[PDB]
Amino acid sequence: KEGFDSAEAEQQLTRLLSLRHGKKDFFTWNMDGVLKTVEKTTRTLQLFLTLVAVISLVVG
Amino acid sequence: GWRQFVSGFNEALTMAWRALAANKMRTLLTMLGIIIGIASVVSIVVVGDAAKQ
Known about the structure:
This is part of a larger assembly, with 2 copies of chain A. Chain A is mostly helical.
C-alpha cells in the first residue's frame, strides 16, 4: 500500500526472509516496477505521438 | 495544341519565378509550410518502418 515503491522493502523483505529463514531462498520476482517502466514507456509513446502531432499542427 | 502547353510550362515557369519574385517572403513561408510537412512525412515513415524492422 502507501503508493510505496516496489524497489524498496523487497530488499527489506530480502533480509527479512534471510532472517526468519536461516538462509536466502525466497528468490521472489519484483512487482510493480515493471508496471512503472511500462507506464513510462506508454506515456513516452504519448509524448512522441502527441508532440509530433501538435508540432505539425502548429506548422499548420 | 500541346506546343503552347509545354511552352506554357516553361515560359510560365519563368512567369512563376517572377510572380514568386513579387513575394519571395510569402513564397518562403508557403514553401516552408510544404517542406516541414513532407519532410516529416518521409521522416516518420522511415523511422517507424525502421523501428518496426
